[PDB]
């Protein structure tokens, strides 16, 4: 039942800090130490530093250190990670890990994504795609920042379903497809809702896609 | 420093076939070096720790090998499920280091794509913008062209496009596109075509539709 939780995604101006923070479960969280990686978009994995939350001893990979500090809390069960002055350079998805004994990871948090922007949190408009196999799907259109999660049939529709990864706008915004296969003939008998959830500015919409006329 | 070198940043290889990912340590680290497998949107799965250790859960055909400086992870008969990219790091000596990651797609037969196109919502049209989609679906190879014709008029510029991960299961593609205009000049025009070429298709194949009808 060993699992780590990381809270959810971030929007940083330049500048300013963030706590991220990740829970543990299924173990003892006294007993083995916690590292926290970097994934910059479209790139690989960086080594930040570890932490032993039996005691609170750490240290830190030292390009990360006028960046990172590491911090936990037994009461709770929870390990944080304060990113300062951070730079637009500083965006990424930053893992929390739990060692076993050495050097090596077995166990991995879900991942946490950080934007540093100094622009606004807008949230999406969700439009109808609409057409034997017919297609149909959602467009999530001018959010920011990124992510935004989608579902259909509140995850009861997963099959022949794609959702693509969103594009970046000239306008500076995120605009995202999310479409799924089905038979033509289950458009007037089965309902097809859309679940859009874009929880940096905690917009949760739900869009009933339907043939028009 | 201490830098791990994996070195084909991409590998295309047909299911069955075996494969060999090579990890250069740029300094001797004897049986310490670990493989991680990353699928679009997880995190890092631990397949080999230690140089070629086994590790519970994963599959009998993952394999490592190697000792000091150059290290091999290997597939025995690779599965469209192992797409993916691969990690290896340094397990010896801080700070904890990272290869830049081997990316693996798996070949299948030809497999043209289904093609719809979808008309901008009223709803989205009353906002002053038009976003008219294409969706590519379940295609291979990668390679495809999408091409923008209103009123027979190429299209440039005005488009974004983005294609989805390898599929696990049937190892196909899929791809959206979107052409935005604007409200006045999407309705000063009749046929909007999205036009698609991709080897799997004897001859470039049109969806289209007039504005309106």
């Known amino acids: 039942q060993v699992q780590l939780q990381q809270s959810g995604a971030e929007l940083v101006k330049p500048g300013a800090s963030v706590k991220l923070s990740c829970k543990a479960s299924?173990?003892?969280?006294?007993?083995?130490?916690i590292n926290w990686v970097r994934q910059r978009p479209e790139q690989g994995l960086e080594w930040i530093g570890w932490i032993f939350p039996g005691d609170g001893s750490t240290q830190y990979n030292e390009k990360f250190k006028g960046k990172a500090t590491l911090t936990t809390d037994t009461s709770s069960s929870t390990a944080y990670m304060q990113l300062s002055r951070l730079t637009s350079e500083d965006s990424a998805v930053y893992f929390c890990?739990?060692?076993?004994?050495?050097?090596?990871?077995?166990?991995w948090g879900q991942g946490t994504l950080v934007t540093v922007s100094a622009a606004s949190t807008k949230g999406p408009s969700v439009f109808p795609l609409a057409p034997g196999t017919a297609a149909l799907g959602c467009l999530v259109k001018d959010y920011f920042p990124e992510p935004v999660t989608v579902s259909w049939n509140s995850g009861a529709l997963t099959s022949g379903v794609h959702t693509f990864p969103a594009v970046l706008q000239s306008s500076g915004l995120y605009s995202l497809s999310s479409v799924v296969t089905v038979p033509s003939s289950s458009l007037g008998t089965q309902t097809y809702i859309c679940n859009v959830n874009h929880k940096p500015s905690n917009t949760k919409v739900d869009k009933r896609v339907e043939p028009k006329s | 420093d201490i830098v791990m070198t994996q070195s084909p940043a991409t590998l295309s290889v047909t299911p069955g076939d075996r494969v060999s990912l090579s990890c250069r340590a740029s300094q001797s680290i004897s049986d310490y070096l670990h493989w991680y497998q990353q699928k679009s949107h997880e995190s890092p799965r631990l397949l080999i720790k230690?140089?070629?250790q086994s590790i519970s859960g994963i599959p009998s055909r993952f394999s490592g090998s190697g000792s000091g400086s150059d290290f091999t992870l290997s597939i025995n008969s690779v599965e469209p499920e192992d797409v993916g990219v691969y990690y290896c790091?340094?397990?010896?000596?801080?700070?904890?280091?990272f290869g830049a990651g081997t990316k693996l797609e798996l070949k299948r037969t030809v497999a043209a794509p289904s093609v719809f196109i979808f008309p901008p919502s009223d709803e989205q049209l009353k906002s002053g913008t038009a976003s008219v989609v294409c969706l590519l679906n379940n295609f291979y190879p990668r390679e495809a062209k999408v091409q923008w014709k209103v009123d027979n008029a190429l299209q440039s510029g005005n488009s974004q496009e983005s294609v989805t991960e390898q599929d696990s299961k049937d190892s196909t593609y899929s791809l959206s596109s979107t052409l935005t205009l604007s409200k006045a000049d999407y309705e000063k025009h009749k046929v909007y075509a999205c036009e698609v070429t991709h080897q799997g298709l004897s001859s470039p194949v049109t969806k289209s539709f007039n504005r309106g009808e």
């Open positions: 890990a739990r060692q076993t004994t050495a050097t090596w990871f077995a166990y």
């Open positions: 230690y140089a070629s």
């Open positions: 299924g173990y003892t969280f006294t007993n083995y130490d």
């Open positions: 790091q340094n397990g010896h000596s801080f700070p904890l280091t």
